[PDB]
Amino acid sequence: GIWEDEDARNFYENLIDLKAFVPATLELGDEAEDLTKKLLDEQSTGSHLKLIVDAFLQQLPNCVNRDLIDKAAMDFCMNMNTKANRKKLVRALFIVPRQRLDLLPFYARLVATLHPCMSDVAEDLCSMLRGDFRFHVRKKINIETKNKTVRFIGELTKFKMFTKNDTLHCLKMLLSDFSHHHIEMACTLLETCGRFLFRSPESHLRTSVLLEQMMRKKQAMHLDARYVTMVENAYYYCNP
């Protein structure tokens, strides 16, 4: 049993089969989202189409349930699919605000639902999310933005848009320099998709090794109490 509920099994595994359809100090989030937002802002059957796409993107933040987000996918796939439009979608998905963590699972569902008939949405978003992750792992920018990036990767992992091996590499990078911001990013990552990784047979053994290395490290490396407790809680959350 990989999932807790039956709602979870269905939210992550029962997607609408779209392939049945027609072939048709700084003023910042992070620097990555600011740069992406400015690319979006810079820019007549296409002026009508642009209009309906800008409507569509501006409505995404309201698709707060399973039925609403699946509809959005059908709407996009049937009236708006266009190289230029796929790039705008990817970029609107990537600049999700940190204050709407609740969107991440729906945004991941959209991406995974589109993937079988326009994979490049997944490819671009993942590539963007990977690069921002690398950036966060190198610096020391508010922990709350970093946690948005890591949560989004987690949701995408549960949908298999990131492979187990991808996200395990993320975790391994954070365990190499096990410092304050990296410990939290790690614990956020494991809260989001650690059980998926631990329970899945393909990833179980490597997750477990890494979980035990984190526990070994809280004692061994004398972290201050707050992070000792953080690591423990993420551990017992995956491996109770």
Numbering used by the authors: 457 to 480, 529 to 532, 534 to 548, 559 to 655, 658 to 757
What does the publication say?
Nonsense-mediated mRNA decay (NMD) is a eukaryotic mRNA quality control mechanism that recognizes transcripts with premature termination codons (PTC) and promotes their degradation. Human UPF2 (Q9HAU5) is an ∼140 kDa protein containing three conserved MIF4G (Middle portion of eIF4G) domains that are found in a number of proteins involved in RNA metabolism and translation such as the nuclear cap-binding protein CBP80 and eIF4G (eukaryotic initiation factor 4-gamma). UPF2 interacts via its third MIF4G domain with UPF3b and via its C-terminal extremity with UPF1, thus forming the central component of the ternary complex of UPF proteins. Here, we present the atomic resolution crystal structures of the N-terminal (MIF4G-1) and middle (MIF4G-2) domains of UPF2 and a lower resolution crystal structure of the combined UPF2 MIF4G-2/MIF4G-3 domains.
The crystal structure of UPF2 MIF4G-2 (residues 455–757) shows that the core MIF4G fold of 10 antiparallel helices (residues 561–756) is preceded by an ∼100 amino acid region (residues 458–560) that contains additional elements essential for stability. The first part of this N-terminal region (458–478) folds into two short α-helices (hA and hB), which together with the connecting loops pack against helices h2, h4, h6 and h8. The interaction is mainly hydrophobic, involving Ile458, Trp459, Phe467 and Tyr468 of helix hA and Pro620, Phe621, Phe676 and Phe713 of h4, h6 and h8. Two salt bridges are also established between Glu460 and Arg712 and Arg716 on helix h8. Helix hB and its adjacent loops pack against helices h2 and h4 via hydrophobic interactions. Residues 481–558 following helix hB are largely disordered in the crystal structure (apart from the short helix hC) and indeed this region is highly variable between species. Similar to MIF4G-1, the N-terminal region stabilizes the interhelical packing of the MIF4G-2 domain helices. In fact, residues 458–478 are evolutionarily conserved within UPF2, and the expression of MIF4G-2/3 constructs lacking this capping region yields mostly insoluble protein. Notably, superposition of MIF4G-1 and MIF4G-2 shows that the capping helices hA and hB in the two domains pack against the same region of helices h2, h4, h6 and h8. We solved the structure of UPF2 MIF4G-1 and MIF4G-2 domains at 2.6 and 2.4 Å resolution, respectively, using SAD on seleno-methionine substituted protein crystals.
